[PDB]
Amino acid sequence: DSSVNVALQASFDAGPYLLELLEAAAAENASSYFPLLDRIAEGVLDDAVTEKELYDRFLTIVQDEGHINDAADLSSFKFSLAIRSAVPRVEAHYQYYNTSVEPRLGTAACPVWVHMDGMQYCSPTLADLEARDLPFDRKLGDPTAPLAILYADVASPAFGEYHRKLSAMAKEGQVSYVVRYRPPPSASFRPLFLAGYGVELTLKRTDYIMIDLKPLSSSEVARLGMNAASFILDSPDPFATLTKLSQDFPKYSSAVAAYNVTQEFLDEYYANRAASLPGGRNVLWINGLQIDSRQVDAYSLLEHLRHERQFIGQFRKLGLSNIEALDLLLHQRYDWRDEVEGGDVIIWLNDLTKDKRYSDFPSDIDALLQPTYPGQLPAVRRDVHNVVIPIDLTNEDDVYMVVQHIQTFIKRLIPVRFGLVPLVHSEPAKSQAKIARYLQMTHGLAAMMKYFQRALEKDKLARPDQALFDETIASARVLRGKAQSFEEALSSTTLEEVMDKTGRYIKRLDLGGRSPPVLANGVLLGRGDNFLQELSMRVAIDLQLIQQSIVQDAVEEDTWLPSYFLSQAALTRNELIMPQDPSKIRIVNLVQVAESHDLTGTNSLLMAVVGDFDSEAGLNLLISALKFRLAHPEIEVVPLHTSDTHVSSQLYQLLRTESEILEKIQIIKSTSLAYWAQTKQLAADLGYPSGTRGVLLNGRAVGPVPSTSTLAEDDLEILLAYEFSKRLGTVAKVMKDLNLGHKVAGSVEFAKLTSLVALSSAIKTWNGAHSAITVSHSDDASINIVATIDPASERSQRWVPILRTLSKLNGVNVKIFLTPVRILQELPIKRFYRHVLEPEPSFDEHGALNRPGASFSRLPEDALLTLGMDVPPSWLVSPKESVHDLDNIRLSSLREGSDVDAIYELEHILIEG
């Protein structure tokens, strides 16, 4: 008889396997690129291009690189070729060149050439589409005004001597150089078979049902899962047992029914409720770090695996063991009321406790129950819900918001109270605000809108004309009017202290600029995003939290309910430093084996105040920073700056003869070598390019922004406190808590460690006695994969081969906890599975790369089986045509010795939009 085979092919076809080498090379350590290229220019792969000489003459080359000749980097790289994937970047260079370059070119005799500022030549002696920094590019030289874009197929000696001393230009320092590859004649491509997918053969009609010819089993099944583990655990070599067992579960089933489950059936069934607390599910960790079941894929794993080894690899800089380091790694509202200065900044359109729209319905709090959503809360005149909407009366969007439906909710008796702060963030936005304020203050409570109503609509609010002003003063319709001013409302009684009073409330709460958030019971709602239903929802959330309060353990009627929301621990400020709307936390370290290493009280945390001293926010940040160094003497600061004058020059001996003294020097300066060389540069690399500014705190970054004291002292240690946080403070208290005096004594090197932890979690895995198929060294595996694998899940079947492939990677521990199901209510794994995934591209040949595939020999006939595919979410794939129904496969009905050689196709993936 014979079998059933499956392979899978990419729609588009690969170029010379050689490129894929190069791009797989920098896939590991990326700096590898050009240096390889430097020497390969000398063509030590320039003899025959058959894949394995250039392959092995390649490996013997890259093992001349410390970048990729680590212990295991070089294994990761093996994997990446058995891993199909260096081609895609290669494919990019092509798709650009085929669509963006060769079309826009016209007419050729020259086969390789560069883009320089215009045209060029087929000779290396030295225009509507420009030299733009494309995604796949690699810059050689530092990136300035000049760019040299080399187009060439790197494979033939034909190219050879362009680069060699176009490798002589940045070298001296002239034009920035980047290499983009050429596509060959369309006849050069040879095909591309893939891996990292799985092949289903599910039992469509079978006797393998519950109550070689064709399996059976009954309701010894809740057991089937149980037992399946001991079964694996009692074989001499268990991991291998694991593998065959999963592969073809349904046929082995009626066997595994009569083999009861062993002693660490249950000392790990309650020992799962201490360590490793999943029961029967599949989760995966890489160094304790859970992976999600949607990236249990070969690709994902690979680039996670090595954006893990270096991060840790980054620790042996300080000289560490790390059987120690990763058991090292283990162990919302804002105040909205304008009170704080003044007491009538905010303009409240609504007032529950006073507006008569909200009639006379009682305030009984405990009568505040059972709502249908035609009515989220009964009508009760309590202060509960408060929404503060910051507005630019210059912004048209804003006004339309309020004039129609801020106005309607009120009107539709919604028990929510609304208010505005007028943004005073432009010469016109204030004036309107001025105007605005002046109406309810003199010409009372409706004129303003019924100004802004008519101002909004057919006039445009872009600027406030008084022509309109005087017309609505005449109106007092709904209104009326005491405290006259009229005219040009240029009063001093307004110009600043409703204005700075609005002015700082804003800047208190950080609401300047283009679009400021919304205050919904203290929680910020981005107005940029839709929010009106999130408003409607964050209320109905916030509602119950109060109902939760009152129903239970609560206060009586003599308490102000919004206190409840507002009573947290978090006061009154910024969305940048503490950016918990975009949870953008920039951590910046690691990478400082730069051209820096400049060296310049116990352990101490570390702050740099990087600035543009000599200017706006220059000293203003710096003085703010310094009154801060006093307030908090814990840390010594190292300021740095970026400009393009002899007035920051005592900055350069703040104390340099061997500070506080200085902290008054610059305030007496406020009204009146090559340090700089590195500062800005080595600033610009921490963000803070070219003048742009903020401060660092021991790995914590900020950035630059709009005004000059937005980064003030108050801000600095609301920064520190939840910078100190459960982040960088605690680092101190887990010390070498574990022991040694310190290998990280310094405050500079402590600064370093604090970064890495902030890059980060799933706290603990433990109890494996002899109830765990271990598959690696527990020691300084500079990778730890733990994973729990249910012997009888379907999900497990992908997982296992991957693990063998992963485990058979060098320096990649893999350990497996069988965690079967309590009581399998039905038959799990009703299919056959094997997985296409090798850890090195293999050969075994007449000389050419192996096309990865599957092979289904030894299957029960007489009954229908279905071939499906198992593969990443992003993959679209079709099966080519055949005499056989690939859904309907009954090996009986067939002819002997012949079989089914199926080949699916990766037709691109998924472009939608």
Numbering used by the authors: 29 to 135, 139 to 157, 166 to 250, 283 to 402, 415 to 683, 694 to 737, 742 to 755, 760 to 773, ...
What did the published study say regarding this structure?
Remarkably, the quality control system is equipped with an elaborate backup mechanism employing a molecular ‘gatekeeper’ that can specifically catalyse reglucosylation against incompletely folded glycoproteins as potential substrates, thereby regenerating monoglucosylated glycoforms for their return to the chaperone-assisted folding process. This gatekeeper function is executed by a unique enzyme, UDP-glucose:glycoprotein glucosyltransferase (UGGT). Our results reveal that UGGT has a modular structure in which the 35-kDa catalytic domain is tethered to the 125-kDa folding-sensor region. The N-terminal folding-sensor region is composed of the four Trx-like domains and the β-domain assembled into the C-shaped structure with structural plasticity harbouring the central cavity displaying hydrophobic patches, which putatively accommodates incompletely folded glycoproteins.
